[PDB]
Amino acid sequence: HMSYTWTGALITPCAAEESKLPINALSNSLLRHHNMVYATTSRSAGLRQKKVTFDRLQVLDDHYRDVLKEMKAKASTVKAKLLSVEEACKLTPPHSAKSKFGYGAKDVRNLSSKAVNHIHSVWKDLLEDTVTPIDTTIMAKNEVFCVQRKPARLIVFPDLGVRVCEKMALYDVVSTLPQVVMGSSYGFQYSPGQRVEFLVNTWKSKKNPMGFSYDTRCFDSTVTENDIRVEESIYQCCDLAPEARQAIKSLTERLYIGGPLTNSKGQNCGYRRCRASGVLTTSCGNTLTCYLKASAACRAAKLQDCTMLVNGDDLVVICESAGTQEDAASLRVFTEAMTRYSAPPGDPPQPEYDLELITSCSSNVSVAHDASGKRVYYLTRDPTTPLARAAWETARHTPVNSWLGNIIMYAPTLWARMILMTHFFSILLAQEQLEKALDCQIYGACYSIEPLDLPQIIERLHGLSAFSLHSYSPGEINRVASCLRKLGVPPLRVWRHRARSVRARLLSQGGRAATCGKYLFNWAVKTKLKLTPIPAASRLDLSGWFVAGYSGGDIYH
Ligand SMILES: Cc1cc(CN2C(=O)C(C3=NS(=O)(=O)c4c3ccc3c4CN(S(C)(=O)=O)CC3)=C(O)[C@@H]2C(C)(C)C)ccc1F
Hey, which of 214, 366, 409 would you mutate to test ligand 1's pocket, going by the most ligand atoms within 8 Å of its Cβ? Predict the structure, then answer.
């Protein structure tokens, strides 16, 4: 029961790949230690192939089936609708990979007759054929990291026509079912503000709180055929149109369970029998399966008063402590159970008794003070990776502007405000690109966002205090300064100086640019303004935001 089998054909690139950090006239203003930053390339795909390839054994017990039964009960309450071809098309990102059958993403988005004709013929084939494996492409991802080198992650995805069909059959399901089945434990429903609030309240709810994150080693490759059939049975609990049921059976049999793996040059690379990382159901499937296995493992480990927070395979548990030594033993049994369920650990879970020492979705809780001196909890992270990616993005336009994603989700943090906002607004002013819409990915979905709308977006996800936090914690200040020394990033005093300039330059522009000056950089001046609610923030359609996760799912808003 191997996760993959291979032919020896290489996982090839589409385009030229750079691994070394590109340097331009802006690079040194952000980061001097250039040799510490690299991008992954297809050249490391062979090592990843080794890592993701292993035998899965699964031992399923009554705790597993009990939880599953409970999950299906909740799933039966869901009604989902089929999308029209045209609805599905409009959810397609403008730069999504083109079909093999003579059309591309902009063809799909424009409802070009050729595209829509192909999609109708794909749909009809799903309805008629529930057996034939569907072809997928396997590609190496190019992502940027700091040293101390990771091999490239793999992405496996079916043809554009199929992807539109997935949307038609399952978009409403994957959008609505996770929150119904998992309620408050479903992470992708929450803005950052809502997530910190859930974490802090959950911690406070316990008499003696203990918490841990569980890291599954290569979660996608631990997902078995059983797991994928169980996912399908959950989806099938929904109130669905007859064509939707047939299409979901067909996609499950022909695509989700497994299939052939073709490189960008058309050569067969092998065969997958685990989760495809690049399908509509990757996030929803991962979340449900992670939740099922973890909920049953909690019961196996007799952890008391378990509260879970699950975003795909990212799992945090907060529960009642039994003292340190017993907690350690309980975690060992939790892991044993997970392992029997085919989700063994990368790093062994560590129990934590301070909420701020728990990392989940790569973030920890920390504390600052708002304008009134009130303590405010917010989410932050070690800024090394964000800054290494910012440095790549200073010299190269990328399909995913991670800095924008980071300014949005980590707006309240010391490092996003002082460094990211300052640096990137300086660049945008110089190139007259304040108004130019840019793509970023939040909870796996693509969003086209104009930088001038940042203040309103930040207000809506975080509140006005995002523009007012001060008196950050010693350990957080210390982590940021340390990171800046490691990377050769100028110290925070330099950034304050530049922000004052950027702020002025922005106010000179007037209008929405001045509003950016006023809100984003009020921390940089000594005569602070009073920041009042933004009129445009009440008008923003932030629907689409924080309903669900869609990593690998080819979704655009
Ligand atoms: C303040 C704050 C900051 C973050 C950091 N972020 C993430 O972790 C993801 C994320 N996107 S995803 O859906 O691709 C995904 C994420 C996290 C874990 C996981 C996944 C997706 N999966 S999967 C492949 O199983 O769906 C693995 C687990 C994000 O979009 C943001 C980011 C913009 C800064 C990157 C998160 C919540 C939050 F409140």
Answer: 409
Rounded to 5 degrees, φ, ψ at 57 are -115, 135
Residue 101 CA to ligand 1 center (angstroms) comes to 33
Please report the atom of ligand 1 found closest to the CA of residue 550: 13
Say if residue 220 carries a ligand binding annotation. no
Contact 388, 438 (CB under 8 A): no
> How was this entry determined?
X-ray
Q: Which residue has the tokens 């009960």?
A: 73
Tokens of 243: 């064509």
Cβ pair 330, 211 in contact under 8 A: no
Domains of the chain: 1-55+133-158+258-273 (no CATH), 56-132+159-182+224-257+274-280 (no CATH), 183-223+281-361 (3.30.70.270), 362-557 (no CATH)
Cα 68 from Cα 288, distance rounded (Å) = 10
What the block records as the tokens of 148 is 């101390």
CA of 189 to the centre of ligand 1 (A): 12
CB 39 within 8 A of CB 143: yes
Please work out whether the CB of residue 380 comes within 6 Å of at least one atom of ligand 1.
Answer: no
125 is in an annotated binding site: no
CA–CA dist 513, 124 (Å, integer)? 50
Q: Which of 320, 325, 324 is nearest to 302 (CA)?
A: 320
What whole-number distance in Å separates Cα of residue 21 and Cα of residue 1?
40
DSSP label at residue 147: -
For strand 438-442 and strand 136-140, is the pairing parallel, antiparallel, or unpaired? unpaired
| Residue located nearest, by CA, to atom 10 of ligand 1 | 443
CA of 24 to the centre of ligand 1 (A): 30
**Centroid of ligand 1 to alpha carbon of 363 (angstroms):** 10
The resolution, in angstroms to one decimal, equals 2.0
Task: Give the residue carrying structure tokens 């033993």.
Answer: 329
Question: What is the spatial distance between Cα 237 and Cα 297, in angstroms, rounded to a whole number?
Answer: 24
Cβ atoms of 31 and 389 closer than 8 Å: no
3-state secondary structure 297-356: HHHHHCCEEEEEEEECCEEEEEEECCCHHHHHHHHHHHHHHHHHCCCCECCCCCCECCHH
**Beta strands per DSSP E along 28-98:** 37-39
Report the alpha-carbon distance of residue 414 to residue 394 in Å, rounded. 20
At residue 364's C-alpha, the angle toward residues 193 and 148, to 5°, is 140
H helices of 410-523, in order, are 414-415, 422-430, 454-462, 474-487, 492-509, 511-520
Query: Is the CB of residue 551 below 6 angstroms from any atom belonging to ligand 1?
Result: yes
